[PDB]
Amino acid sequence: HWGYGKHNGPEHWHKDFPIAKGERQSPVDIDTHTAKYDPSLKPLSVSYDQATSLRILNNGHAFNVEFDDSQDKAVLKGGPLDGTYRLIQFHFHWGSLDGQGSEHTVDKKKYAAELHLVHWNTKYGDFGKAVQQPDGLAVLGIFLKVGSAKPGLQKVVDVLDSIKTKGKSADFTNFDPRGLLPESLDYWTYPGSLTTPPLLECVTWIVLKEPISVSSEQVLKFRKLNFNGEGEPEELMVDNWRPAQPLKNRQIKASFK
Numbered sequence: 001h002w003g004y005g006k007h008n009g010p011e012h013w014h015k016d017f018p019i020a021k022g023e024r025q026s027p028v029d030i031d032t033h034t035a036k037y038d039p040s041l042k043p044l045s046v047s048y049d050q051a052t053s054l055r056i057l058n059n060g061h062a063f064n065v066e067f068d069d070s071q072d073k074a075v076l077k078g079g080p081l082d083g084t085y086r087l088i089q090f091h092f093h094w095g096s097l098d099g100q101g102s103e104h105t106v107d108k109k110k111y112a113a114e115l116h117l118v119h120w121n122t123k124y125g126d127f128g129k130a131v132q133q134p135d136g137l138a139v140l141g142i143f144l145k146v147g148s149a150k151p152g153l154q155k156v157v158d159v160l161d162s163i164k165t166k167g168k169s170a171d172f173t174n175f176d177p178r179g180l181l182p183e184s185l186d187y188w189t190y191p192g193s194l195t196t197p198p199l200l201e202c203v204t205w206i207v208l209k210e211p212i213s214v215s216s217e218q219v220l221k222f223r224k225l226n227f228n229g230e231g232e233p234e235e236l237m238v239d240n241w242r243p244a245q246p247l248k249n250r251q252i253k254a255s256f257k
């Protein structure tokens with residue numbers, strides 16, 4: 001089935017999932033000289049104080065930190081968004097090398113990694129329903145670069161040993177996502193898709209401008225993860241990003257002047 005390799009990578013996806021070549025695919029390149037400041041955008045509201053994580057899973061392409069979304073706890077609202085979008089999980093995409101890893105790019109620049117905090121619109125009752133809707137999902141995307149350690153990431157770093165291979169999960173309660181954020185909430189926004197199959201065109205992207213910095217030794221542990229499951233040939237989980245897709249005359253708006 002789908003992967004990031006030569007024979008099952010992003011370039012093969014269109015065969016099972018024809019929407020891969022659709023009209024609002026992600027990720028895209030953010031051209032900063034083409035993005036327009038948008039006066040109408042209300043300020044972004046990221047309310048993660050009551051966030052209730054449950055567990056962390058290696059799903060054979062990335063690791064997901066999953067949250068309890070059966071109440072309006074961790075919620076994204078405001079900005080380009082109408083209503084309330086409940087946090088369901090976060091995950092990363094990263095490279096084999098620091099020069100690559102992110103999915104979105106800024107004026108062609110690839111970051112070392114990219115964080116996706118996935119949220120579903122609470123007027124659709126559940127995640128599965130929301131992804132059948134064009135405004136069903138909001139994703140907060142945050143670029144990673146290599147510099148100093150992100151203290152609020154180290155707890156995630158620490159657990160990776162125990163979820164090495166496809167299918168493993170460990171308990172991951174009381175993680176606080178607030179320590180994954182950069183200082184500023186300036187952002188670019190456009191309508192787009194999930195970046196993994198089934199690539200559904202259900203996403204409002206909010207991509208932060210200010211990257212977080214993580215340490216060389218933090219990203220190193222990310223790259224020690226396995227695509228394969230226990231007792232299979234070792235295939236390092238690296239380069240699990242989709243490249244930039246055609247914008248197709250979408251509009252990227254900036255929250256900042």
Ligand SMILES: O=C(O)/C=C/c1ccccc1O
Pocket residue numbers: 059064088089118127196
């Ligand atoms: O495997 C994934 O990429 C997501 C799995 C998932 C499961 C439950 C809820 C949301 C999800 O993204």
Ligand SMILES: [Hg+2]
Pocket residue numbers: 130131132133134135136200201202203
């Ligand atoms: Hg959709």
Ligand SMILES: [Zn+2]
Pocket residue numbers: 091092093116195
């Ligand atoms: Zn993602």
